[PDB]
Design a binder for this molecule. Structure first.
Ligand SMILES: C1CCCC(Nc2nnc(C3CC3)o2)CC1
Length: 149
């Protein structure tokens, strides 16, 4: 699995996080991130992917130790945590061919799991447009509690 890098951008209240909506298999909402290039350092890949997807440069804000990393299906995803970005920042992807929309979401309102279908006695999970973000939500809330209060 080629590792991916990106960011969790939060506003100044720490309430809201910046998600991006793709197309097709990436049609839902997720954190801005993408695959590392040959010989590219993690921090540079995170900044490149975030600038390509949001038009916002995190380079001067990345902290080396402040990230959440998950291994999903034997692919590693690491999102640098970037707090205090004002909600009135103008975000604009580099190309609309990959990114449909960019929005702030309330962290407390986001799901941290998908819903089963126990009502229908059917196995599996109900669709959720936050599926790409979900795995990071509980680890984020725990990280924020520890590092802030
Ligand atoms: C569109 C822009 C690129 C970021 C993307 N984030 C994402 N999180 N998981 C995946 C799947 C590959 C496993 O993608 C979704 C939004």
């Amino acid at each position: 699995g080629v590792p991916t890098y990106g960011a969790i951008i939060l506003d100044e209240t720490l309430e809201n996080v910046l998600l991006v909506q793709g197309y097709l298999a990436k049609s839902g909402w997720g954190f801005p991130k993408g695959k590392v290039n040959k010989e590219e350092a993690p921090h540079d890949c995170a900044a490149r992917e975030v600038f390509e997807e949001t038009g916002f440069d995190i380079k001067d804000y990345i902290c080396k130790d402040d990230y959440i990393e998950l291994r999903i299906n034997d692919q590693l995803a690491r999102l640098y945590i970037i707090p205090g970005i004002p909600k009135d920042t103008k975000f604009n992807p580099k190309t609309r061919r990959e990114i449909r929309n960019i929005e702030w979401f309330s962290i407390e309102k986001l799901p941290c799991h998908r819903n089963d279908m126990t009502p229908k006695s059917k196995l599996g999970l109900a669709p959720n447009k936050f599926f790409m973000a979900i795995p990071f939500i509980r680890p984020l809330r725990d990280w924020l509690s520890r590092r802030f209060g």
